Design a protein around this ligand. Structure first.
Ligand SMILES: *C\C=C(C)/C=C/C=C(C)/C=C/C1=C(C)CCCC1(C)C
Ligand SMILES: CCCCCCCCCCCCCCCCCCCC
Ligand SMILES: CCCCCCCCCCCCCCCCCCCC
Ligand SMILES: CCCCCCCCCCCCCCCCCCCC
Ligand SMILES: CCCCCCCCCCCCCCCCCCCC
Ligand SMILES: CCCCCCCCCCCCCCCCCCCC
Ligand SMILES: CCCCCCCCCCCCCCCCCCCC
Ligand SMILES: CCCCCCCCCCCCCCCCCCCC
Ligand SMILES: CCCCCCCCCCCCCCCCCCCC
Ligand SMILES: CCCCCCCCCCCCCCCCCCCC
Ligand SMILES: CCCCCCCCCCCCCCCCCCCC
Length: 265
């Protein structure tokens, strides 16, 4: 299937690479449930006119909690310990590790996370429906073509790469359109609100860029380097979790802070 199952069935996993990976993944959906409560409880702190952004964050948490829980359970019960060798190996009587849960979660979250900014800042010369369509199209295509390259990950590396680059073309359009959005949104508002906007732009840039870095991770030290191992498995799964907390939770907190800042007058 994937590089994970390859390692789980060629070399297997050490006790620590298995446990660590399960612990970080558990932490991942535990944070989503925490955020879900944060965004519901604080929805009263923002004016009626920005609340849609709290609403969109609440829903992202519901799906992120739900699907990252599935993934977590999917990693723990796909490998079983072998007393003879002392590692964890892919269990042929299980379901095999499946990263589909996480791609499904992106296909849902991406439109919302992109849509919700447009309820906090105001455009100037760009049209709302124009920006929204461009966000929804390129973001959908970024995930679909990423999913397709994800199949060739362990077999045909070249297709894994050509498809990853296509998905990168859509990624950069989004980065261009969000650039234009944050600029127009800075026009008018107070200097404090521009400060928050700039933070949001810095965070949006890093947090989304971690994702292709975790897509490629087991190849960044070569077709037989240090990461082509349970360590790249470990590391790709740590970067995703860092990325999920950044692009889903912290992003939405900053938008709420921005909404609040924009009610001073
Ligand atoms: C959970 C929320 C979000 C916004 C997830 C975003 C995921 C990405 C930006 C993924 C991007 C990819 C790219 C650009 C190319 C390689 C394949 C990926 C799907 C990892
Ligand atoms: C608004 C008040 C912010 C307090 C949020 C603290 C969250 C604690 C996380 C779990 C410990
Ligand atoms: C700006 C207001 C203060 C920010 C508080 C952010 C709290 C977010 C709650 C989710 C984080 C939970 C971390 C521990 C869960 C395990
Ligand atoms: C209004 C009080 C802030 C609520 C924090 C969200 C709950 C975090 C649970 C961990
Ligand atoms: C609209 C937010 C709720 C989306 C939930 C997505 C379906 C969760 C599936 C979990 C198991 C598969
Ligand atoms: C268009 C593809 C976007 C992601 C779909 C992945 C769906 C996988 C669902 C999980 C399967 C569990 C078995
Ligand atoms: C307003 C949100 C519109 C998109 C939500 C669902 C994302 C794609 C689901 C398939
Ligand atoms: C300047 C206000 C803080 C912006 C970034 C906060 C998130 C850093 C990671 C926690
Ligand atoms: C646009 C894709 C970004 C990938 C970041 C990975 C950098 C690898 C450095 C070695
Ligand atoms: C805002 C979050 C910043 C995260 C920086 C990247 C984390 C590095 C982890 C690399 C592990 C290998
Ligand atoms: C004005 C800007 C203030 C933004 C505060 C950003 C920090 C949010 C804290 C939530 C982090 C939760 C991560 C917990 C994982 C362990």
């Amino acid at each position: 299937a994937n590089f994970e199952n390859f390692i789980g069935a060629t070399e297997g996993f050490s006790e620590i690479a298995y446990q660590f990976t399960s612990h970080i993944l558990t932490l991942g959906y535990a944070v989503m449930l925490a955020g879900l409560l944060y965004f519901i409880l604080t929805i009263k702190n923002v004016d009626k006119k920005f609340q849609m952004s709290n609403i969109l964050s609440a829903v992202v948490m519901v799906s992120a909690f739900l699907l990252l829980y599935a993934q977590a359970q999917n990693w723990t019960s796909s490998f079983t310990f072998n007393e003879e060798v002392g590692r964890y190996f892919l269990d042929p009587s299980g379901d095999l590790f499946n990263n589909g849960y996480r791609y499904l979660n992106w296909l849902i979250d991406v439109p919302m996370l992109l849509f919700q900014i447009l309820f906090v800042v105001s455009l100037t010369t760009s049209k709302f429906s124009s920006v929204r369509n461009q966000f929804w199209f390129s973001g959908a295509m970024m995930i679909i073509t990423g999913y397709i390259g994800q199949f060739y990950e362990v077999s045909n590396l070249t297709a894994f790469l050509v498809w990853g680059a296509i998905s990168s073309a859509f990624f950069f359009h989004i980065l261009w359109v969000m650039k234009k959005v944050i600029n127009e949104g800075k026009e008018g508002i107070s200097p404090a609100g521009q400060k928050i906007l700039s933070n949001i732009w810095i965070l949006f840039l890093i947090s989304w860029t971690l994702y292709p870095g975790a897509y490629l991770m087991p190849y960044l030290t070569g077709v037989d380097g240090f990461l082509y191992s349970e360590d790249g498995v470990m590391a790709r799964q740590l970067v995703y979790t860092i990325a999920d907390v950044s692009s889903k939770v912290i992003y939405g907190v900053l938008l709420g802070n921005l909404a609040i800042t924009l009610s001073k007058n």
